[PDB]
Amino acid sequence: SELSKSSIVDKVELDHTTLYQGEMTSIKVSFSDKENQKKPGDTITLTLPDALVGMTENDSSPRKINLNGLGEVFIYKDHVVATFNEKVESNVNGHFSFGIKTLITNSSPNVIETDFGTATATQRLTIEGVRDYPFFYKVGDLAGESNQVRWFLNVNLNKSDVTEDISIADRQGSGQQLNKESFTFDIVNDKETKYISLAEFEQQGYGKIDFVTDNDFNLRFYRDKARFTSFIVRYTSTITEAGQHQATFENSYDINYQLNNQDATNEKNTSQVKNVFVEGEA
Numbered sequence: 001s002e003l004s005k006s007s008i009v010d011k012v013e014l015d016h017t018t019l020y021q022g023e024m025t026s027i028k029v030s031f032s033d034k035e036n037q038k039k040p041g042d043t044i045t046l047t048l049p050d051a052l053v054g055m056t057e058n059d060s061s062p063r064k065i066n067l068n069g070l071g072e073v074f075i076y077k078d079h080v081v082a083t084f085n086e087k088v089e090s091n092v093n094g095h096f097s098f099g100i101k102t103l104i105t106n107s108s109p110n111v112i113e114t115d116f117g118t119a120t121a122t123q124r125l126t127i128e129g130v131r132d133y134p135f136f137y138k139v140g141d142l143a144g145e146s147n148q149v150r151w152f153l154n155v156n157l158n159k160s161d162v163t164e165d166i167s168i169a170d171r172q173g174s175g176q177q178l179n180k181e182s183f184t185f186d187i188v189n190d191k192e193t194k195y196i197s198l199a200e201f202e203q204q205g206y207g208k209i210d211f212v213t214d215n216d217f218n219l220r221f222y223r224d225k226a227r228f229t230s231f232i233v234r235y236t237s238t239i240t241e242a243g244q245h246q247a248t249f250e251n252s253y254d255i256n257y258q259l260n261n262q263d264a265t266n267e268k269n270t271s272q273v274k275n276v277f278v279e280g281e282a
Contacts (some may be wrong), residue, residue, distance in 0.1 A: 003044040005119050007034040012046060012116050019127045022104035024055065024142055026097045026277040029082075033091035040088040045081040047117030051110065051127055052100040053077045055276070058145050065096055065280035073098070073280055096280030101144060102127050133157040136255050140273040143236060149176055149249045149273055153233035155221065159189065162226045164258035168219040173250030173270070175243025178215045179236045186232040249273045
């Protein structure tokens, strides 16, 4: 039996109902065994709006969650399907979160009203539209269905002169696996713009990087070729078993640099990247 439009489904809740194009958020569907209808074979299945694509595996294959052997859920781009093959008793209580990514169709808002093909309330979802940088900042998001975290080290986007080398000590937060060979450098100045690998970065003498450990590194840009040059470091980390459960993923840095006619400045900080929960208990 299809428990969806049934009384079983208690709610399909999203953190906030105002999304931004490309935004990834977790949707949590809770369920309870009700008197009038209660199992073993039935299926609480949700149908997603064209505006919110569910995130499968990199293989495009279903993202599969498990509800304690009692059942498991499959997640597709078009819909999500929880099934309960066997092993039931007297009353089941559970839930299951899955991740979606708000399609990034361009517009400067788009309001939709959806109940997700459920007996639950219809929700009003709103997907809205879209120099002087600090000498250095770091941002990140999720690779999506890659199960990775993309990190960006934004170095000298204002293209100031530097009088010293630029030292960055990076200590990645927990739950991640540094992908040592995914480092790329976007180098820009008047003369040109280079998109090069870490290997080429060092063989051209822009600097060096030391992998203190497997999740820690030190990045140095040599003073002469860092003058009036901006560097955007792109690299990724993969989410581990222990990680996928975390609320957030983090990365901290300690940077030392000096600019024209100034005393060395030291800055550090920790970047956050919200994780999209994929749970499913009882």
